[PDB]
Design an enzyme around this catalytic site. Structure first.
Site, PDB file in Angstrom:
ATOM      1  N   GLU A 114      -5.724   8.415 -17.735  1.00  0.00           N
ATOM      2  CA  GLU A 114      -4.995   7.817 -18.840  1.00  0.00           C
ATOM      3  C   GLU A 114      -5.853   6.714 -19.441  1.00  0.00           C
ATOM      4  OE1 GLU A 114      -2.951   3.899 -17.225  1.00  0.00           O
ATOM      5  OE2 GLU A 114      -3.571   4.665 -19.192  1.00  0.00           O
ATOM      6  N   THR A 125       1.705   0.241  -5.683  1.00  0.00           N
ATOM      7  CA  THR A 125       2.227   0.933  -6.856  1.00  0.00           C
ATOM      8  C   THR A 125       3.039   2.178  -6.534  1.00  0.00           C
ATOM      9  OG1 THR A 125       0.328   2.398  -7.190  1.00  0.00           O
ATOM     10  CG2 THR A 125       0.183   0.160  -8.117  1.00  0.00           C
ATOM     11  N   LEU A 171     -30.056   4.565   0.071  1.00  0.00           N
ATOM     12  CA  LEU A 171     -28.731   4.956   0.554  1.00  0.00           C
ATOM     13  C   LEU A 171     -28.786   5.538   1.962  1.00  0.00           C
ATOM     14  CD1 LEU A 171     -26.956   6.513  -2.568  1.00  0.00           C
ATOM     15  CD2 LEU A 171     -26.813   4.195  -1.622  1.00  0.00           C
ATOM     16  N   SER A 193      -9.200   3.949  -5.436  1.00  0.00           N
ATOM     17  CA  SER A 193      -8.132   3.574  -4.522  1.00  0.00           C
ATOM     18  C   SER A 193      -7.756   4.758  -3.645  1.00  0.00           C
ATOM     19  CB  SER A 193      -6.888   3.094  -5.276  1.00  0.00           C
ATOM     20  OG  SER A 193      -6.403   4.092  -6.164  1.00  0.00           O
ATOM     21  N   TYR A 204      -4.944  -8.905 -10.115  1.00  0.00           N
ATOM     22  CA  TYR A 204      -6.008  -7.925  -9.922  1.00  0.00           C
ATOM     23  C   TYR A 204      -7.368  -8.532 -10.242  1.00  0.00           C
ATOM     24  CZ  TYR A 204      -2.981  -3.838  -9.189  1.00  0.00           C
ATOM     25  OH  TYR A 204      -2.084  -2.917  -8.685  1.00  0.00           O
ATOM     26  N   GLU A 222     -30.584   4.673   4.447  1.00  0.00           N
ATOM     27  CA  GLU A 222     -30.643   3.635   5.471  1.00  0.00           C
ATOM     28  C   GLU A 222     -29.252   3.144   5.860  1.00  0.00           C
ATOM     29  OE1 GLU A 222     -33.825   0.735   4.565  1.00  0.00           O
ATOM     30  OE2 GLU A 222     -33.170  -0.330   6.378  1.00  0.00           O
ATOM     31  N   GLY A 279      -3.577   5.651  -5.465  1.00  0.00           N
ATOM     32  CA  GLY A 279      -3.302   6.239  -6.758  1.00  0.00           C
ATOM     33  C   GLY A 279      -3.417   7.753  -6.744  1.00  0.00           C
ATOM     34  N   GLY A 280      -2.763   8.383  -7.725  1.00  0.00           N
ATOM     35  CA  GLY A 280      -2.865   9.829  -7.857  1.00  0.00           C
ATOM     36  C   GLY A 280      -4.241  10.274  -8.319  1.00  0.00           C
ATOM     37  N   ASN A 323     -10.377  -8.656  -7.700  1.00  0.00           N
ATOM     38  CA  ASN A 323     -11.553  -7.847  -7.991  1.00  0.00           C
ATOM     39  C   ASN A 323     -12.826  -8.677  -8.063  1.00  0.00           C
ATOM     40  OD1 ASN A 323      -9.856  -5.690  -8.024  1.00  0.00           O
ATOM     41  ND2 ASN A 323      -9.998  -5.288 -10.233  1.00  0.00           N
TER      42      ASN A 323
HETATM   43  N1  LIG Z   1      -7.894  -4.413  -5.510  1.00  0.00           N
HETATM   44  C1  LIG Z   1      -7.387  -3.707  -6.516  1.00  0.00           C
HETATM   45  N2  LIG Z   1      -6.467  -2.712  -6.260  1.00  0.00           N
HETATM   46  C2  LIG Z   1      -5.953  -1.989  -7.285  1.00  0.00           C
HETATM   47  C3  LIG Z   1      -6.332  -2.233  -8.598  1.00  0.00           C
HETATM   48  N3  LIG Z   1      -5.657  -1.370  -9.393  1.00  0.00           N
HETATM   49  C4  LIG Z   1      -4.864  -0.589  -8.619  1.00  0.00           C
HETATM   50  N4  LIG Z   1      -5.039  -0.976  -7.313  1.00  0.00           N
HETATM   51  C5  LIG Z   1      -4.413  -0.408  -6.119  1.00  0.00           C
HETATM   52  O1  LIG Z   1      -4.537   0.995  -6.204  1.00  0.00           O
HETATM   53  C6  LIG Z   1      -3.337   1.614  -5.788  1.00  0.00           C
HETATM   54  C7  LIG Z   1      -2.772   2.364  -6.980  1.00  0.00           C
HETATM   55  O2  LIG Z   1      -3.757   3.261  -7.420  1.00  0.00           O
HETATM   56  P1  LIG Z   1      -4.339   3.237  -8.920  1.00  0.00           P
HETATM   57  O3  LIG Z   1      -5.851   3.127  -8.926  1.00  0.00           O
HETATM   58  O4  LIG Z   1      -3.703   2.111  -9.704  1.00  0.00           O
HETATM   59  O5  LIG Z   1      -3.785   4.645  -9.478  1.00  0.00           O
HETATM   60  P2  LIG Z   1      -4.724   5.663 -10.283  1.00  0.00           P
HETATM   61  O6  LIG Z   1      -6.011   5.921  -9.530  1.00  0.00           O
HETATM   62  O7  LIG Z   1      -4.982   5.070 -11.654  1.00  0.00           O
HETATM   63  O8  LIG Z   1      -3.917   7.062 -10.379  1.00  0.00           O
HETATM   64  P3  LIG Z   1      -2.599   7.315 -11.282  1.00  0.00           P
HETATM   65  O9  LIG Z   1      -1.462   7.666 -10.357  1.00  0.00           O
HETATM   66  O10 LIG Z   1      -2.877   8.488 -12.187  1.00  0.00           O
HETATM   67  O11 LIG Z   1      -2.257   6.104 -12.119  1.00  0.00           O
HETATM   68  C8  LIG Z   1      -2.399   0.516  -5.351  1.00  0.00           C
HETATM   69  O12 LIG Z   1      -2.600   0.337  -3.972  1.00  0.00           O
HETATM   70  C9  LIG Z   1      -2.923  -0.690  -6.081  1.00  0.00           C
HETATM   71  O13 LIG Z   1      -2.615  -1.860  -5.371  1.00  0.00           O
HETATM   72  C10 LIG Z   1      -7.259  -3.235  -8.863  1.00  0.00           C
HETATM   73  O14 LIG Z   1      -7.610  -3.471 -10.021  1.00  0.00           O
HETATM   74  N5  LIG Z   1      -7.782  -3.969  -7.815  1.00  0.00           N
HETATM   75  C1  LIG Z   2      10.849  -0.942 -10.818  1.00  0.00           C
HETATM   76  O1  LIG Z   2      11.075  -0.948 -12.199  1.00  0.00           O
HETATM   77  C2  LIG Z   2      10.332   0.009 -12.900  1.00  0.00           C
HETATM   78  C3  LIG Z   2       9.085   0.396 -12.434  1.00  0.00           C
HETATM   79  C4  LIG Z   2       8.349   1.342 -13.127  1.00  0.00           C
HETATM   80  C5  LIG Z   2       6.974   1.767 -12.614  1.00  0.00           C
HETATM   81  C6  LIG Z   2       5.956   2.065 -13.515  1.00  0.00           C
HETATM   82  C7  LIG Z   2       4.698   2.454 -13.045  1.00  0.00           C
HETATM   83  C8  LIG Z   2       4.464   2.543 -11.677  1.00  0.00           C
HETATM   84  C9  LIG Z   2       5.503   2.238 -10.756  1.00  0.00           C
HETATM   85  N1  LIG Z   2       5.549   2.242  -9.395  1.00  0.00           N
HETATM   86  C10 LIG Z   2       6.768   1.876  -9.032  1.00  0.00           C
HETATM   87  C11 LIG Z   2       7.256   1.746  -7.591  1.00  0.00           C
HETATM   88  C12 LIG Z   2       6.344   1.505  -6.566  1.00  0.00           C
HETATM   89  C13 LIG Z   2       6.790   1.387  -5.249  1.00  0.00           C
HETATM   90  C14 LIG Z   2       8.143   1.510  -4.959  1.00  0.00           C
HETATM   91  C15 LIG Z   2       9.073   1.755  -6.003  1.00  0.00           C
HETATM   92  C16 LIG Z   2       8.637   1.872  -7.297  1.00  0.00           C
HETATM   93  C17 LIG Z   2       9.785   2.112  -8.105  1.00  0.00           C
HETATM   94  C18 LIG Z   2      10.864   2.126  -7.224  1.00  0.00           C
HETATM   95  N2  LIG Z   2      10.422   1.914  -5.996  1.00  0.00           N
HETATM   96  C19 LIG Z   2      11.258   1.859  -4.810  1.00  0.00           C
HETATM   97  N3  LIG Z   2       7.499   1.639 -10.111  1.00  0.00           N
HETATM   98  C20 LIG Z   2       6.736   1.857 -11.217  1.00  0.00           C
HETATM   99  C21 LIG Z   2       8.859   1.903 -14.287  1.00  0.00           C
HETATM  100  C22 LIG Z   2      10.106   1.518 -14.753  1.00  0.00           C
HETATM  101  O2  LIG Z   2      10.622   2.084 -15.925  1.00  0.00           O
HETATM  102  C23 LIG Z   2      10.007   3.286 -16.291  1.00  0.00           C
HETATM  103  C24 LIG Z   2      10.842   0.570 -14.060  1.00  0.00           C
HETATM  104  O3  LIG Z   2      12.101   0.182 -14.529  1.00  0.00           O
HETATM  105  C25 LIG Z   2      13.166   0.685 -13.778  1.00  0.00           C
HETATM  106 MG   LIG Z   3      -3.655   5.366 -13.371  1.00  0.00          MG
END
Ligand SMILES: Nc1nc2c(ncn2[C@@H]2O[C@H](COP(=O)(O)OP(=O)(O)OP(=O)(O)O)[C@@H](O)[C@H]2O)c(=O)[nH]1
Ligand SMILES: COc1cc(-c2cccc3nc(-c4cccc5c4ccn5C)[nH]c23)cc(OC)c1OC
Ligand SMILES: [Mg+2]
Ligand SMILES: Nc1nc2c(ncn2[C@@H]2O[C@H](COP(=O)(O)OP(=O)(O)O)[C@@H](O)[C@H]2O)c(=O)[nH]1
Ligand SMILES: [Ca+2]
Ligand SMILES: [Cl-]
Ligand SMILES: [Mg+2]
Lengths: 54, 437, 424, 352
Positions: free
Chosen positions: B71, B179, B252, B140, B224, B254, B143-144, B228
């Site tokens: 994204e 997240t 690398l 990370s 962050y 080594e 993340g997905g 970072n």
């Molecule tokens: N230290 C640090 N951790 C990060 C940062 N951004 C995200 N994270 C950690 O990475 C994890 C979430 O993964 P992301 O890298 O944000 O997700 P993604 O790789 O963008 O994949 P998507 O699901 O498509 O958004 C969580 O544990 C966050 O705390 C960052 O800028 N610094």
């Molecule tokens: C919590 O509030 C919100 C959060 C998010 C939102 C957007 C992107 C990444 C997110 N990861 C979480 C998340 C992470 C870990 C535990 C969580 C959540 C949510 C409920 N649990 C138990 N939440 C996210 C989006 C919302 O609206 C679309 C919103 O409003 C209701």
């Molecule tokens: Mg992402």
């Protein structure tokens, strides 16, 4: 405590200290895996649309 | 001289990549537009800093970097950023919709639609390389994209560049800055698929960095950006030997030689000292002895765990600043008699030392004070397996009820990949306990 | 990115109108769709809900649906009536007579393709549509019957987008007709199959709140809708305002829904407001938002367990304090959060507070106690269905008794599903 | 209100500690696998130390010291004393001991055990030895009785000098050992419980047949079943400190403090201070405490010998009430405050 392999430069130096001595699958397999999973997705979509058609 | 390409995947890998390349430019005296006046060879060279930067006829110094996110919001800020001129548009790669915290969506569904484009933009960088060592991969666990797409990229890099080395910098998930509730799932899945494709991986627990910024920078809620800039200081410590004149960790290979005797146990613990607030009015500069001792306090490690209750397989000390061997050795001597440091029987009890005389560079307006000497310790200890135990337990709790599993099956992943990944982790935890107990 | 909004029937359009009034006031947009605000924060995410028109006018991505013209004539005449795209008013003349069958099978089927044309025209104008949100009641005919028909058609045409509903549950304490349990049971079966996340808004709870804590002696639907639009504002905060969490329905679904059918959320709001001056402390927000008396679904949270919780704090406050307080309720009442989903409570903060309050908190709980709502509807359904009472309204539209029997079975199954994880 | 978890239901001492904590009205027990606890009263085997101290918003404390098994397993204790300069081979209060694995499994010390065993029937001196493992004990004057025995079983034993000249209480001409309860808190304060117990033999001591092992092994179990006179002199074969003191005053013109307790405090403190750098939780993300049971022997010269350290001890039934209350006060309320100390703090700072 032996200090060995000392190298010096103007940027710094490195060395080694010794306290004590000693007491990948194919592209074909990956494309197939990615497309098996794509088939499972399009099957599940087809079963939904068949359910909506009913 | 041999080039290294850095690959940043997902939000975490890209934003940490931003911090690292900011820091690199400050260290090599490279301006945000890419001009390096001290580089007297215009249009090329084979200096050590040329491992990470390339040169253009107009003298612009260009990172050997690829940024990848599914994204565009995160990489767009790179394109409009302070260092927008530094990067070539072809190196910034975005999709339209992300992997939604879903390993299977990043690996199978969206990964398949972008992978070839990424390998193409990677190959253009590799084509400007007279000799490529391999790759540094930032992402990370949770993340997905960071988990799902990275494991896909790592599989194909093994195919396209089979004899090249591949290093990971991996952010381990922490609820304080987390997240997704499924981050344990993603972590297990990407670790299982990436394991054989990684020669060396440096784990950073967001928990440890968070608490280091609270306790030592007196930041109540670290951002962050706080996290970072500290992380990039550590990464810079680890990579300095690829970018500077020296004789330790010069390529690398080594890193695996010196840090990884067993290929599956390829997760060295990083410990960094000192971290000092820039708001600290009066600071007593810490000595070689004090900062080396600090490398054995768990509160300074990138992963909280107790190395007293494990065994070492290798230990490197990378110093920056006013440090000379005599004082390192006096420091090691004292620390050996006051601390529990046991190696595995089949390894020498010993330390590989690297000194660079330039102290750490700080970012202006940052939170890190300038110091006259700092050290980063890389030790391959079995105590880091504590973090695999934490992760695997959280995985077991959810998977026993198949909670959230349907989100993965729905992207075409089979449920069995879950148990296969979890069994690989089961093997890994016992490998560690064989070596270390 | 973009969300397409749909509001169907009398209840759906009255609450949908209030929602667009409340959040357009938040974002600075006036009834003619012209911006007149202070901050740039108001417009960073404005595109999730608004299309930008010629002259940088902002028009809701909102489609208004009814089988009669009465309510939508009053929307067009209301405060923000001219903010809506006029082509987006889709209405019949027949009405649905509080009859799910008329909304779903006869009267509604005739109008539905017309609605999908306006949806399609809105979708194809979105850089990256993430999904749809529907506001409607389950107890009438249009919002219940046609609303779920639209949800089925939209899924057919967009099977990979997110479907999200704000669904008003009927209650004998606030009741238009005796057939509401019939319409609601038929609707729930559709909702469990074809939505990703349903905010269960119980007219029972809304009445009790208006009655006992707001001390309004005869609550009108207007008073009920003040609570709904305040709550809807709160749950969509991250969809509309800049934050370290993106406006992402899918990521919300992934984190809230461990099992596909268990996507029925119990909303809550604090401080409970009526149409006052005292600062609420972060400790007060946190305790009230979890209070059973602030729940918009008339279910006792202490009777079940929380699978997942999303909490959204609004206003100028210490996120260190929010964090401490959130961690406090979890560690203080860890019995009521399932132990097999680690860290199942997530908090978000947004500096911009709702109008009239310097601090608020919005609660979104996926509790197994929601089964109480579905049992209550099930018992009301069965009391009439065992005598086939009032069925002729439905068989006269082509429906068979079997379809009722199946709908009742599927809702009882859903009840059993919830009970299964309350003891796991 | 604080929270805790019980993961050893077979524990007499923490059973009472569990119950005493709820009675405060400020502690609530959670289910065994709920991770949102302040306090873990953990299992004895494979306690998951690596999962502790990673829950935000919770100070976490556990009733065991990770790494304290080095003290509390016979083979490890022997290894620890010889190898550590602060215990040293030259350690006056530990019986000479040797590690020996069965030949079924094969470091091992049976080679060096022979070397001293021979100067012992060379040198005329009493060469009786004991053999035991971490039930199955042998006391013989001739080694191949010993090494034969350990070949017979499959786990690693230790051979230790049998104290042929113990102190015998009269009337009875009977053996005994001393059990002392030690509490190490999260600050690594070392607390000795004011009350110990003597586990007496009911049988007169006999240095001619080391095979009838009921006048030779003071264990509370071996005495209530296999012994003629269980309970004749003292209730439950348990003499406590007030009685043992007055006996020492009447019979030997000494006190318990001077003749025995100073040695006991010196031993406890030296053992625990040795391993402190390896187990301390002072700067860890979680914290430890642990209750230990030290077992001592007294020879006829009134010299104290350490026989073993128990890492999961039970208490004497008369003493559970006071000791467990003490654990809550200085080991638990220490960390989690609620809304004439039974312990002696072991501390000594001699300057040189
Ligand atoms: N230290 C640090 N951790 C990060 C940062 N951004 C995200 N994270 C950690 O990475 C994890 C979430 O993964 P992301 O890298 O944000 O997700 P993604 O790789 O963008 O994949 P998507 O699901 O498509 O958004 C969580 O544990 C966050 O705390 C960052 O800028 N610094
Ligand atoms: C919590 O509030 C919100 C959060 C998010 C939102 C957007 C992107 C990444 C997110 N990861 C979480 C998340 C992470 C870990 C535990 C969580 C959540 C949510 C409920 N649990 C138990 N939440 C996210 C989006 C919302 O609206 C679309 C919103 O409003 C209701
Ligand atoms: Mg992402
Ligand atoms: N909360 C609320 N409930 C309403 C409102 N209008 C109708 N209802 C409820 O919705 C049900 C009637 O459905 P309605 O929307 O009027 O029928 P429809 O036009 O066919 O969709 C009954 O349960 C009413 O109590 C409203 O403005 N607010
Ligand atoms: Ca050059
Ligand atoms: Cl290659
Ligand atoms: Mg009506």
């Amino acid at each position: 405590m032996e200090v060995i392999e000392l190298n010096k430069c103007t940027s710094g130096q490195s060395f080694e200290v010794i306290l004590k001595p000693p007491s990948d699958p194919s592209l074909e397999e990956i494309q197939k895996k990615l497309e098996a999973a794509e088939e499972r997705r399009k099957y599940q979509e087809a079963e939904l649309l068949k359910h909506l058609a009913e | 001289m041999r080039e290294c390409i850095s690959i940043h995947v997902g939000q975490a890998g890209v934003q940490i990549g931003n911090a690292c390349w900011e820091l690199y430019c400050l260290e090599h005296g490279i301006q945000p537009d890419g001009q390096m006046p001290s580089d007297k060879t215009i249009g090329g060279g084979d200096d050590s800093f040329n491992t990470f930067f390339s040169e253009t006829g107009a003298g612009k110094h260009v990172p050997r970097a690829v940024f990848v996110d599914l994204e565009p919001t995160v990489i767009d800020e790179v394109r409009t950023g302070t260092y927008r001129q530094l990067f070539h548009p072809e190196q910034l790669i975005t999709g339209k919709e992300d992997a939604a915290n879903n390993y299977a969506r990043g690996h199978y569904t969206i990964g398949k639609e972008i992978i070839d484009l990424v390998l193409d933009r990677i190959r253009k960088l590799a084509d400007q390389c007279t000799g490529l060592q391999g790759f540094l991969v930032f992402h990370s666990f949770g993340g997905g994209t960071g988990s799902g797409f990275t494991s896909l990229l790592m599989e194909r890099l093994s195919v396209d560049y089979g004899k090249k080395s591949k290093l990971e910098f991996s952010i381990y998930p922490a609820p304080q800055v987390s997240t997704a509730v499924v981050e344990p799932y993603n972590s297990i899945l990407t670790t299982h698929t990436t394991l054989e494709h990684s020669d060396c991986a440096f784990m950073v627990d967001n928990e440890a960095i968070y608490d280091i910024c609270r306790r030592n920078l007196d930041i109540e809620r670290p951002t962050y950006t706080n996290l970072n800039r500290l992380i990039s200081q550590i990464v810079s410590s680890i990579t300095a030997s690829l970018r500077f004149d020296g004789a330790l960790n010069v390529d690398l290979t080594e890193f695996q030689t010196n840090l990884v005797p067993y290929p599956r146990i390829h997760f060295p613990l990083a410990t960094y000292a000192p971290v000092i607030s820039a708001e600290k009015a009066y600071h007593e500069q810490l000595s070689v002895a004090e900062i080396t001792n600090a490398c054995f306090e768990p509160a300074n490690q990138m992963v909280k765990c107790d190395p007293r209750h494990g065994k070492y397989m290798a230990c490197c000390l990378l110093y920056r600043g006013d440090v000379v061997p005599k004082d390192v050795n006096a420091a090691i001597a004292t620390i050996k008699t006051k601390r529990s440091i046991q190696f595995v029987d089949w390894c020498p009890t010993g330390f590989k030392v690297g000194i660079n005389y330039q102290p750490p560079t700080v970012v202006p307006g940052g939170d890190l004070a300038k110091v006259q000497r700092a050290v980063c310790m890389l030790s391959n200890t079995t105590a880091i397996a504590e973090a695999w135990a934490r992760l695997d337990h959280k995985f077991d709790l959810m998977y026993a009820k198949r909670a959230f599993v349907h989100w993965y099956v729905g992207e075409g992943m089979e449920e069995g990949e879950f148990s296969e990944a979890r069994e690989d982790m089961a093997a890994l935890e016992k490998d560690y306990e064989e070596v270390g107990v | 990115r973009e969300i397409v909004h749909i509001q169907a029937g009398q209840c759906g359009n009255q609450i949908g109108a209030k929602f667009w009034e409340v959040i357009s006031d938040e974002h600075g947009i006036d009834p003619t769709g012209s911006y007149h605000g202070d901050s740039d924060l108001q417009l960073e995410r404005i595109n999730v809900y608004y299309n930008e028109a010629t002259g940088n006018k902002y028009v809701p991505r909102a489609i208004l649906v009814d089988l009669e013209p009465g309510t939508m004539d009053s929307v067009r005449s209301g405060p923000f009536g001219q903010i809506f795209r006029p082509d987006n008013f889709v209405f019949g003349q027949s009405g649905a007579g509080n009859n799910w069958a008329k909304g779903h099978y006869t009267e509604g089927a005739e109008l539905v393709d017309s609605v999908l044309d306006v949806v399609r025209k809105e979708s194809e104008s979105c850089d990256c549509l993430q999904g749809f949100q529907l506001t409607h009641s389950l107890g009438g005919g249009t919002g219940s019957g046609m609303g779920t028909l639209l949800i089925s058609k939209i899924r057919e045409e967009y099977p990979d987008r997110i479907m999200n509903t704000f669904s008003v549950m009927p209650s004998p304490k606030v009741s238009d007709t005796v057939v509401e349990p019939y319409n609601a049971t038929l609707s729930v079966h559709q909702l469990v199959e074809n939505t990703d996340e349903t905010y269960c808004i119980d007219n029972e709870a809304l009445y009790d709140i208006c009655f006992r804590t707001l001390k309004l002696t005869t609550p009108t639907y207007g008073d009920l809708n003040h609570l709904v639009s305040a709550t809807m504002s709160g749950v969509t905060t991250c969809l509309r305002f800049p934050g370290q969490l993106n406006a992402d329905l899918r990521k919300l679904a992934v984190n809230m829904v461990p099992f596909p059918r268990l996507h029925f959320f119990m909303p809550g709001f604090a401080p409970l407001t009526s149409r006052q001056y005292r600062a609420l402390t972060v400790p007060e927000l946190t305790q009230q938002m979890f209070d059973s008396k602030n729940m918009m679904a008339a279910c006792d949270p202490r009777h079940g367990r929380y699978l997942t919780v999303a909490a959204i704090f609004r206003g100028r406050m210490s996120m260190k304090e929010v964090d401490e307080q959130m961690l406090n309720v979890q560690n203080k009442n860890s019995s009521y959060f399932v132990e097999w989903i680690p860290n199942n409570v997530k908090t978000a903060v947004c500096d911009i507070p709702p109008r009239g309050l310097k601090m608020s908190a919005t609660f979104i709980g996926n509790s197994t106690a929601i089964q109480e709502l579905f049992k209550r509807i099930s018992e009301q359904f069965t009391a009439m269905f065992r005598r086939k009472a009032f069925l002729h309204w439905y068989t006269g539209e082509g429906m068979d008794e079997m379809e009722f029997t199946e709908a009742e079975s599927n809702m009882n199954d859903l009840v059993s599903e919830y009970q299964q994880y309350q003891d796991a | 209100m604080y929270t805790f978890v019980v993961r050893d239901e077979n524990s007499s001492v923490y059973a009472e500690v569990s119950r005493l904590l709820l009675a405060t009205g400020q502690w609530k027990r959670l289910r065994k696998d709920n991770p949102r606890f302040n306090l873990m009263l953990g299992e004895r085997n494979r306690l998951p130390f690596g999962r502790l101290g990673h829950e935000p918003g919770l100070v976490q404390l556990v009733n065991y010291y990770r790494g304290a098994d080095k003290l509390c397993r016979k083979a490890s204790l022997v290894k620890l004393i010889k190898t550590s300069p602060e215990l040293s081979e030259s350690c006056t209060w530990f019986p000479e001991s040797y590690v020996i694995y069965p030949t079924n499994l094969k470091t091992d010390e049976r080679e060096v055990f022979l070397a001293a065993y021979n100067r012992r029937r060379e040198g005329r001196e009493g060469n009786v030895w004991i053999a035991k493992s971490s039930e199955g004990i042998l006391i013989s004057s001739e080694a191949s009785e010993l090494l034969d025995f350990i070949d017979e079983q499959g786990q690693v034993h230790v051979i230790q000098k049998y104290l042929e000249k113990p102190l015998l209480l009269e009337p009875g001409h009977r053996k005994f050992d001393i059990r002392s309860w030690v509490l190490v808190d999260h600050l690594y304060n070392i607390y000795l419980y004011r009350e110990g117990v003597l586990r007496t033999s009911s049988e007169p001591y006999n240095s001619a047949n080391f095979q009838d092992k009921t006048c030779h092994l003071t264990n509370h179990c071996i005495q209530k079943e296999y012994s003629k006179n269980y309970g004749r002199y003292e209730e439950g074969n348990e003499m406590f400190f007030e009685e043992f003191n007055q006996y020492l005053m009447d019979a030997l013109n000494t006190t318990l403090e001077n003749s025995i307790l100073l040695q006991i405090k010196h031993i406890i403190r030296s053992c625990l201070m040795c391993i402190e750098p390896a187990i301390s939780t002072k700067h860890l993300h979680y914290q430890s405490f642990q209750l230990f049971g030290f077992d001592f022997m007294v020879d006829e010269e009134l010299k104290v010998w350490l026989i073993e350290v128990n890492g999961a001890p039970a208490c004497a039934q008369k003493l559970y009430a006071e000791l467990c209350q003490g654990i809550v006060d200085v080991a638990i309320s220490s960390v989690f405050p609620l809304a004439t100390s039974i312990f002696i703090k072991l501390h000594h700072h001699h300057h040189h």
